[PDB]
Amino acid sequence: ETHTFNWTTGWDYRNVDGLKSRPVITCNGQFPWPDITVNKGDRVQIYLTNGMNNTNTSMHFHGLFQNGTASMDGVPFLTQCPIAPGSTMLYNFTVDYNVGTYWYHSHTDGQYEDGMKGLFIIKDDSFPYDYDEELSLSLSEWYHDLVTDLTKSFMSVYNPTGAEPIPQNLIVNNTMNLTWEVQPDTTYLLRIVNVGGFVSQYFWIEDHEMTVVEIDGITTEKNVTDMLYITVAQRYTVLVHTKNDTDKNFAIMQKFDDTMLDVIPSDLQLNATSYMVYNKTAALPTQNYVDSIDNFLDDFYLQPYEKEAIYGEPDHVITVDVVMDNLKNGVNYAFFNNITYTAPKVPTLMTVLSSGDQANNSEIYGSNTHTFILEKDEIVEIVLNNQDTGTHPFHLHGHAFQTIQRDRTYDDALGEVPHSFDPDNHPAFPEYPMRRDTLYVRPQSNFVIRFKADNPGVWFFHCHIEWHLLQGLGLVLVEDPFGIQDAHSQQLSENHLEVCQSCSVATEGNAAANTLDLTDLTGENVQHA
Ligand SMILES: *C1O[C@H](CO)[C@@H](O[C@@H]2O[C@H](CO)[C@@H](O[C@@H]3O[C@H](CO[C@H]4O[C@H](CO)[C@@H](O)[C@H](O[C@H]5O[C@H](CO)[C@@H](O)[C@H](O)[C@@H]5O)[C@@H]4O)[C@@H](O)[C@H](O[C@H]4O[C@H](CO)[C@@H](O)[C@H](O)[C@@H]4O)[C@@H]3O)[C@H](O)[C@H]2NC(C)=O)[C@H](O)[C@H]1NC(C)=O
Ligand SMILES: *[C@@H]1O[C@H](CO)[C@@H](O[C@@H]2O[C@H](CO)[C@@H](O[C@@H]3O[C@H](CO[C@H]4O[C@H](CO)[C@@H](O)[C@H](O)[C@@H]4O)[C@@H](O)[C@H](O[C@H]4O[C@H](CO)[C@@H](O)[C@H](O)[C@@H]4O)[C@@H]3O)[C@H](O)[C@H]2NC(C)=O)[C@H](O)[C@H]1NC(C)=O
Ligand SMILES: *[C@@H]1O[C@H](CO)[C@@H](O[C@@H]2O[C@H](CO)[C@@H](O[C@@H]3O[C@H](CO[C@H]4O[C@H](CO)[C@@H](O)[C@H](O)[C@@H]4O)[C@@H](O)[C@H](O[C@H]4O[C@H](CO)[C@@H](O)[C@H](O)[C@@H]4O)[C@@H]3O)[C@H](O)[C@H]2NC(C)=O)[C@H](O)[C@H]1NC(C)=O
Ligand SMILES: *[C@@H]1O[C@H](CO)[C@@H](O[C@@H]2O[C@H](CO)[C@@H](O[C@@H]3O[C@H](CO)[C@@H](O)[C@H](O)[C@@H]3O)[C@H](O)[C@H]2NC(C)=O)[C@H](O)[C@H]1NC(C)=O
Ligand SMILES: *[C@@H]1O[C@H](CO)[C@@H](O[C@@H]2O[C@H](CO)[C@@H](O[C@@H]3O[C@H](CO)[C@@H](O)[C@H](O)[C@@H]3O)[C@H](O)[C@H]2NC(C)=O)[C@H](O)[C@H]1NC(C)=O
Ligand SMILES: *[C@@H]1O[C@H](CO)[C@@H](O[C@@H]2O[C@H](CO)[C@@H](O)[C@H](O)[C@H]2NC(C)=O)[C@H](O)[C@H]1NC(C)=O
Ligand SMILES: *C1O[C@H](CO)[C@@H](O)[C@H](O)[C@H]1NC(C)=O
Ligand SMILES: *[C@@H]1O[C@H](CO)[C@@H](O)[C@H](O)[C@H]1NC(C)=O
Ligand SMILES: *[C@@H]1O[C@H](CO)[C@@H](O)[C@H](O)[C@H]1NC(C)=O
Ligand SMILES: *[C@@H]1O[C@H](CO)[C@@H](O)[C@H](O)[C@H]1NC(C)=O
Ligand SMILES: *[C@H]1O[C@H](CO)[C@@H](O)[C@H](O)[C@H]1NC(C)=O
Ligand SMILES: [Cu+]
Ligand SMILES: [Cu+]
Ligand SMILES: [Cu+]
Ligand SMILES: [Cu+]
């Protein structure tokens, strides 16, 4: 079945918070943006039109593998060139390899924080568990200023610390103090999605246990908890069974991970209360006080319903250290090893599709682009060493990876230093590792993920904290470029080329005109020595 949408971006005032009428990004004049629900193997065709006066746009469908259709991933200068004001890009893709809970968001500057985001649900007939009803909750933080404005003082010489701007409130389904009307003795499938741009959240329901049955599109064995820690971009789908009494109402609770906040403003409501309503007439629940925020479920120990044994020894190991540092222009950037992601003059995919037999040479994709080439079916391992004292949720396009190590917090307040993964010295990896698309490193810690390069494409690996992505915390994976070239489904459509010309962005071979293919590029500001 084909679902066709016609959506146009725009700006309108809303008071999402309850406390500031403020421009938000609308879809055809409406807010919030719609949610898509399709069946396994359906076709989705979205005509996105940039109706904004002065920004570019894009749309990325988070978690979808885009197998055979990399062009549709929606990452400017990886997958497409940006959508210019007035232009219309057609996103045309099938959904043959994904099931469960996903979302879509703009992949331009900070755009999605300003409202351009929505849920994408794929149903399957073979979901193992029973439930009576189903819904979602979209957790997020909310700012009173647009990202464009915050960026001016975020990426600034008057911000040498790289301190990320502090949000004004937590929101659910684009309000505060939300009502969820329930029926007694009923099992609800509750999709909890963190569609925020920055802050991790703790989530729990007063006097109700939660049975985790899916993370990031991957069905899991039932795991019961009282509390979840959800980073931005991740999804926990959870079974909740309601009580027999219609006598009392219960608090739905979301809490900031204030650890991630540079400073805590004294008036910021760190924890927000919503309402699970059994009785429409009874007392609205007060805040549910919790004794500890240290006993949330560690998703590392989750067990996929479809077991896959840990992949064998890696053919390709990528080791990256994560740090924040100041450059020559005095502003604070984010680094994978010694590289801040700096967008190229020609989108990654566009150069692979016109480099012919030189697509295997890493040099042509640029030096300041952090591009790696992955071989036909090789097992790839990413080793990430956090040298920064914060938590980061890293996300990988095109794959759900195996999480084989994710070390403990190394708290610098207790005097502890950063620790890297040591291939010679580490706990035994799990036999059947957890799988997902978005995973956090703990402060000053490390993680190791593994996946098979079985999905020809161009895939972004980055921190999903919008501020850190703006700081350039990302790298590019090119999965067998020859596999990309050989597949017909992968060739760029007339519409996409039309977007590029309308944007005055080339489809050549990184800078140079398909002529020597050895560059004279676009670099990062030089180092501080
Ligand atoms: C859910 O329920 C919550 C709590 O009930 C509702 O939030 C309340 O909203 C009202 C109306 O928007 C707020 O009243 C306004 O208060 C401001 C001053 O606000 C400041 O001082 C407060 C007192 O300590 C403090 O609570 C505020 O903190 C909040 O805001 C900051 C961001 O600013 C945020 O980070 C925090 O997390 C808090 O949310 C804040 O520091 C006052 O200036 C307002 O305007 C008056 O004057 C002007 C005249 O120019 C006029 O426009 C108005 O009519 C008014 O006369 C107004 O009094 C109230 O502070 C909020 N209460 C709390 C405790 O947060 C929320 O709206 C509900 N959500 C929904 C339905 O979306
Ligand atoms: C926060 O925001 C999210 C949206 O982002 C809301 O999520 C939606 O919640 C509603 C329930 O409140 C869900 O609606 C239910 O969908 C079920 C399945 O979808 C079927 O229907 C459509 C038809 O176009 C097709 O996809 C296909 O037919 C599916 O089978 C239905 O079972 C429900 O249908 C209706 O009839 C039955 C009669 O038995 C009634 O019981 C229902 O109430 C209803 O009238 C129902 O429509 C919806 O799926 C959720 N969407 C998403 C994206 O998850 C949250 O509700 C909101 N949170 C709060 C508290 O407001
Ligand atoms: C949405 O719309 C487009 C999407 O691409 C953006 O417009 C482009 O912006 C980029 C950067 O964001 C521009 O790239 C820059 O070009 C500079 C000058 O190049 C011009 O001059 C030659 C002259 O022959 C032209 O051929 C060319 O088209 C340009 O007009 C470069 O100087 C910049 O790189 C580097 O400059 C300094 C100076 O030494 C170096 O030190 C650094 O390496 C630095 O990176 C840079 O590459 C591009 O020109 C813009 N227009 C296009 C492609 O038409 C919008 O920015 C975007 N809107 C927003 C903000 O959302
Ligand atoms: C949305 O994407 C799909 C996937 O490519 C497009 O469907 C395809 O459309 C093309 C041309 O419109 C079809 O090409 C035709 O192929 C036949 C043989 O199958 C050949 O005889 C013709 O000469 C022609 O080239 C292609 O078959 C078709 N595939 C499917 C799955 O239907 C679609 O066009 C895209 N755009 C739209 C309509 O929005
Ligand atoms: C936001 O949420 C947190 C967590 O719910 C709130 O902190 C909690 O505050 C309560 C009391 O205000 C603490 O309970 C105490 O527990 C001991 C048990 O030994 C008991 O003897 C005391 O009588 C008391 O009840 C609780 O520890 C504390 N939770 C944590 C993890 O610190 C916080 O107050 C909320 N923010 C608000 C409403 O301003
Ligand atoms: C449910 O999750 C828990 C942890 O959240 C897993 O059980 C234990 O987890 C600890 C770490 O706290 C590990 O040392 C062990 O794997 C378990 N310990 C005990 C008490 O035996 C469990 O694996 C999960 N169950 C699922 C997904 O079915
Ligand atoms: C969507 O509808 C608009 C009206 O806002 C119309 O102009 C356009 O043709 C439609 N989009 C596409 C590209 O089909
Ligand atoms: C709702 O709660 C009130 C007490 O606040 C009670 O009087 C009323 O009967 C309840 N409604 C039902 C039918 O559950
Ligand atoms: C850091 O990466 C390598 C390390 O040897 C070096 O060649 C390169 O110049 C540095 N990156 C850039 C281009 O800033
Ligand atoms: C891509 O499709 C191929 C062919 O069906 C399949 O073998 C592979 O597993 C797919 N990759 C992903 C990421 O689903
Ligand atoms: C690129 O992969 C090919 C196999 O297609 C192989 O010959 C070689 O090891 C790789 N070459 C480079 C330049 O890394
Ligand atoms: Cu995403
Ligand atoms: Cu993604
Ligand atoms: Cu980060
Ligand atoms: Cu991304």
From Swiss-Prot:
Q: Where does Cu cation 3 bind?
A: 107, 397, 462
Q: Indicate the segments forming the Plastocyanin-like domain, all copies.
A: 11-125, 136-280, 341-481
This protein's species is Saccharomyces cerevisiae (strain ATCC 204508 / S288c)
Which domain of life does the protein's organism represent? Eukaryota
Which cofactors does this protein require?
Cu cation
Listed GO CC annotations: endoplasmic reticulum; fungal-type vacuole; high-affinity iron permease complex; plasma membrane
Instruction: Provide the reaction this enzyme catalyses.
Output: 4 Cu(+) + O2 + 4 H(+) = 4 Cu(2+) + 2 H2O
Keyword ATP-binding assigned to the entry: answer is no
Q: What does this protein do?
A: Iron transport multicopper ferroxidase required for Fe(2+) ion high affinity uptake. Required to oxidize Fe(2+) to Fe(3+), which is then transported into the cell via the ferric iron permease FTR1. Essential component of copper-dependent iron transport. Also has cuprous oxidase activity.
User: Anything further noted?
Assistant: Present with 1050 molecules/cell in log phase SD medium.
Descriptive protein name:
Iron transport multicopper oxidase FET3
Organism placement in taxonomy: Eukaryota, Fungi, Dikarya, Ascomycota, Saccharomycotina
The free-text note explaining how the cofactor binds reads:
Binds 4 Cu cations per monomer.
